[PDB]
């Protein structure tokens, strides 16, 4: 297993997301959604909320365990390793890092153990903060939130399509069972929820 930096993805995006058109743009959504879905599949979290923000960024929030908030080597947060090393609930191999590489900015927010942490990356996944404790929450509160702005210098289109996302989340709700998937478009105010009882 040869590990790579985020430059590798930016130089050959087609290798990781297939294309740099709308199909590729939406593959970024699929990667982050799929990480939330994997976490719910393992029994952690019963809702996954997706928001297309007015500024064109996209948020996915889960109520799973929260990505680990500790250190890897050399005082580097485990979260930073997930989002910045390409191994070409989990996590990676290779999703979070590919999305970060192809975003002009990305924020991850983790809630667990009574604490709220945040890390921000810019310009193709360069950390501009460490994993910072930003606040507190009840001990019962857990989850991972990822918001990213796709890189307009990579993609031919940076316009997320509500109907495309809605269909994928409907499908994911049907496969998962007993988990609510929601979509809210802040550009147009549209919203929908999916939940299949089993
Ligand atoms: C909004 C997108 N949603 C998400 O990415 N959800 C995720 N939820 C988890 C939970 C764990 C998690 C927590 N506690 C205990 N075990 C795993 C995890 O672990 C990553 C591990 C360290 C490196 O790879 C294995 N990743 C994720 S991504």
């Amino acid at each position: 297993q040869v590990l790579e930096g985020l430059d590798a993805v930016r130089k050959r995006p087609g290798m990781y997301i297939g294309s740099t058109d709308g199909a590729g743009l939406h593959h970024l959504v699929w990667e982050i959604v799929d990480n939330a879905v994997d976490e719910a599949l393992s029994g952690f979290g019963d809702r996954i909320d997706v928001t297309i923000n007015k500024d064109g960024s996209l948020t996915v929030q889960d109520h799973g365990r929260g990505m680990p908030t500790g250190m890897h080597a050399m005082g580097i947060p485990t979260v930073e390793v997930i989002f910045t090393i390409l191994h070409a609930g989990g996590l990676h191999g290779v999703g979070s890092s590919v999305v970060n590489a192809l975003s002009s900015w990305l924020e991850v927010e983790i809630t667990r153990d009574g604490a709220v942490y945040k890390q921000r990356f810019e310009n193709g996944g360069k950390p501009v903060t460490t994993l910072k404790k930003i606040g507190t929450a009840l001990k019962s509160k857990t989850g991972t939130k990822v918001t990213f702005m796709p890189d307009a210098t990579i993609f031919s289109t940076t316009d997320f399509k509500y109907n495309t996302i809605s269909e994928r989340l409907n499908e994911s709700a049907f496969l998962l069972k007993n988990v609510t998937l929601s979509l809210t478009d802040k550009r147009t105010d549209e919203a929908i929820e999916f939940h299949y009882e089993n």
Side-chain angles (χ1 to χ4, degrees), residues 9-11 13-56:
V9 186
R10 294 182 64 84
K11 276 185 186 174
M15 186 161 177
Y16 306 89
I17 63 167
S19 59
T20 52
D21 60 2
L25 176 68
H26 285 86
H27 189 85
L28 301 183
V29 184
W30 313 155
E31 292 287 354
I32 303 315
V33 168
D34 288 353
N35 293 336
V37 172
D38 282 347
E39 185 65 358
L41 185 63
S42 294
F44 306 108
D46 76 344
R47 86 175 291 111
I48 300 164
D49 296 307
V50 184
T51 306
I52 307 165
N53 304 127
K54 260 189 169 156
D55 63 4

Side-chain angles (χ1 to χ4, degrees), residues 15 24 65 128 184:
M15 186 161 177
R65 291 168 287 186
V128 298
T184 305

Side-chain angles (χ1 to χ4, degrees), residues 32-33 35-36 39 60-62 65-68 78 82 89-90 96 112 144-146:
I32 303 315
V33 168
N35 293 336
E39 185 65 358
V60 183
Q61 184 164 28
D62 78 44
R65 291 168 287 186
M67 300 184 164
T78 300
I82 292 160
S96 292
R112 47 183 295 160
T144 304
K145 181 158 71 158
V146 175

Side-chain angles (χ1 to χ4, degrees), residues 95-173:
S96 292
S97 54
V98 169
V99 172
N100 198 20
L102 296 174
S103 297
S104 49
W105 62 262
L106 187 150
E107 299 194 339
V108 50
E109 287 203 8
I110 305 156
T111 302
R112 47 183 295 160
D113 302 307
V116 186
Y117 311 82
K118 187 177 95 165
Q119 187 159 29
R120 179 182 171 90
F121 310 83
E122 287 175 8
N123 193 22
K126 305 160 176 65
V128 298
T129 77
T130 192
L131 187 70
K132 314 175 99 164
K133 177 178 190 199
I134 52 156
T136 60
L138 302 177
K139 299 271 205 218
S140 50
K141 205 181 183 185
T142 61
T144 304
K145 181 158 71 158
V146 175
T147 303
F148 66 97
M149 183 72 71
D151 194 335
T153 68
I154 301 276
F155 295 95
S156 61
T157 173
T158 51
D159 198 340
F160 293 115
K161 301 273 90 197
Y162 181 91
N163 297 332
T164 301
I165 299 168
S166 163
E167 175 71 291
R168 198 84 168 208
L169 302 179
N170 198 1
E171 289 161 358
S172 304

